């Protein structure tokens, strides 16, 4: 996250940290006790599918304070339309091997209904993006979880205000003055929208031209397009093998 602030401990309780062989991979969002939503592009280079860990209640990477909960990722579900190395349909649904325990530090973000998300949430101007990604373009990653408030743009405005294509499965958010943005290591993390006292999942940190590049905005997976796809999978029985490609729509 570029130009944000430290998320006070426990104020982003749905934030997930994804690890591969103990190394920082991506972010994710907890949506109930066993499911996490992340970005499909996070898994393009994975070979050790069995060494993928999700950490909940994480805040400071240099210290174990007891609120952290680690779980093995039992399944990574990606839409059939996602093509590795590309940006469209950038979403993954992760099943944890064992549920996390909900505490003051581990709480899911509401996955909203499609209609509510399209006709109401899509018009809330500002939303929060968070992660332990780079603090600067070509800079070091954060030790404490960072958060940033970003305004959402209509795609027509994003295309006009900018210096890959922006599809109906994406949306732009951020600033064009090179000061504030999500970064590479924030990938898969939440774009969370507040509405009438409750927070909802509206976007996933997906891609951009560098980090906080002048004349460019952050690009987020438009989660509303995947609500029914996500809901159907969550009502399904697990299958052998970690990676699962599922028909989209």
């Amino acid at each position: 996250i570029v130009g944000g602030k430290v998320c006070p401990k426990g104020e982003c309780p749905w934030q997930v940290l994804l690890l591969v062989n103990g190394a920082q991979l991506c972010g994710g969002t907890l949506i109930n006790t066993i499911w996490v939503v992340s970005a499909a592009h996070c898994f393009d280079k994975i070979k050790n599918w069995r060494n993928l860990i999700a950490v909940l209640g994480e805040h400071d990477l240099s210290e174990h304070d007891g609120d952290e909960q680690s779980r093995r990722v039992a399944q990574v579900i990606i839409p059939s339309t996602y093509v590795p190395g590309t940006t469209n349909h950038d979403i993954a649904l992760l099943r944890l091997h064992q549920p996390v325990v909900l505490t003051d530090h581990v709480v899911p973000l509401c996955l909203p209904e499609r209609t509510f998300s399209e006709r109401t949430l899509a018009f809330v101007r500002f939303s929060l993006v968070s992660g332990w990604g780079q603090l600067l373009d070509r800079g070091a990653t954060a030790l404490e979880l960072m958060v940033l408030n970003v305004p959402r743009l209509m795609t027509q405005d994003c295309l006009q205000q900018s210096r890959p294509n922006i599809t109906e499965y994406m949306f732009c958010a951020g600033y064009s003055d090179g000061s504030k943005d999500s970064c590479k290591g924030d990938s898969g993390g939440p774009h969370a929208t507040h509405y009438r006292g409750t927070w909802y999942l509206t976007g996933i940190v997906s891609w951009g031209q560098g980090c906080a590049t002048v004349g460019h905005f952050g690009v987020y997976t438009r989660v509303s397009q995947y609500i029914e796809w996500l809901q159907k999978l969550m009502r399904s029985e697990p299958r052998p093998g970690v990676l699962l490609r599922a028909p989209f729509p």
């Binding site: 003051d104 509401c110 209609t115 509510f116 006292g197």
Partner: protein, 55 residues
């Protein structure tokens, strides 16, 4: 009714045959008798921050 200001619903809105509207809530919430407000039914409902809620 639902397209305009979420039909007055705090959370989800369903349009019905006629001028009828039903508000609904995410799991871990129940709809109040006002027919619009959602109240938590669990200790850790989704999208709420306990350290801020208890403050």
């Amino acid at each position: 009714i639902c397209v305009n200001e979420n039909g007055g619903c705090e959370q989800y809105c369903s349009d019905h045959t006629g001028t009828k509207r039903s508000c609904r809530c995410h799991e871990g919430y129940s709809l109040l008798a006002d027919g619009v407000s959602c109240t938590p039914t669990v200790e850790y409902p989704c999208g709420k921050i306990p350290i801020l809620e208890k403050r």
